[PDB]
Symmetry: C3
Subunit: 136 residues, 3 copies
Amino acid sequence: GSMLAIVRLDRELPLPSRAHADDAGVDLYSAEDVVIEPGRRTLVGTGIAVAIPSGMVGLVHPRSGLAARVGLSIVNSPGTIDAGYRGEVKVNLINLDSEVPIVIARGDRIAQLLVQQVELPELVEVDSFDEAGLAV
Amino acid sequence: GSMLAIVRLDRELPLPSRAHADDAGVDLYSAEDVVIEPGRRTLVGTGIAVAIPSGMVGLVHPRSGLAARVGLSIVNSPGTIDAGYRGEVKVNLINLDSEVPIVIARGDRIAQLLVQQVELPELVEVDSFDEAGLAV
Amino acid sequence: GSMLAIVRLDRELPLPSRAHADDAGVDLYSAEDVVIEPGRRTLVGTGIAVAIPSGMVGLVHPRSGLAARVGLSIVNSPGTIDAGYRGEVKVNLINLDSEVPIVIARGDRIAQLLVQQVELPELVEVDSFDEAGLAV
Ligand SMILES: [Cl-]
Ligand SMILES: [Cl-]
Ligand SMILES: [Cl-]
């Protein structure tokens, strides 16, 4: 198997973990108590940092279920975390409901983190796609 | 090549299929007739279930083209389907238009399914990233 | 390493490039000057085309930072680009702010392009998941 190094910047939150072996995502928690009014957005810290491996990407998705059903989502979904980035993971949350505010308590699940391989091609300009080495 | 097992829970819908060999996504259909009013959302069944392989993830994306141009999207995009999950695939659809309802007929394309490899690291807490085995 | 062929359909825009070696995404630019009013959407050309390799997918994501903080996103995020598709990459942008228009100048960063491997299974119908060859 493999590992992902994680720092709890906020030591009072629980350590994120993969609940079941097959689960693509790991839930991340809110470091903040906030109320997001209808149609509004706010950047919320998760209180963790990660060391995504070289050649991979971290992907931050909204969650399904009750959270989605109340209209919680992420403005820039999917959020990306580069191997470079070892700062706090912060999530740009939006309330897509038109009438009902979303109350978020500190410790509440607000997003999930996936990890995948990523290709890192150098972009090479061509004048047209009539070049050797391209898909037919 | 490879295969993905699919169950038609709703036997009266057509079987989803990859239209062209290179297509990343396979279109999924609505099992329901519904009208989504401006700014509203609703959870809609696709009438299918899939068996995502161990070590992979299913990813449910909104479609481009006319659907996107009328403002159809998915609240929690991208939706994820774990190797665990063999229930019906349901899509949390939202109408992002401010004035015009979106009419969806049973059998209409409402999302696309991609399949990718996924990494499944165990999350290991560290006090800081000054540890052996990490990207430089 | 690897390469991705890119055509500048609009020769007056700068060539997109991976800013740092570990960056998952490459920023794409607007070929257009446009103002997106609150809650409105518009399809904007990037002035480039790409040749995604066989067996891979291009993924077009919204960007984090100031763009996300003003409410810029993509209706059908993540946008997908197939190995088939060698036309101009166009982005369905939406202003998720309720009050403040988003001004986009020609040359402004409006999205990022990731490249990943993708699985291309043939979908095979089964009557139930009680079949050989499936995850336990
Ligand atoms: Cl490059
Ligand atoms: Cl874990
Ligand atoms: Cl197929």
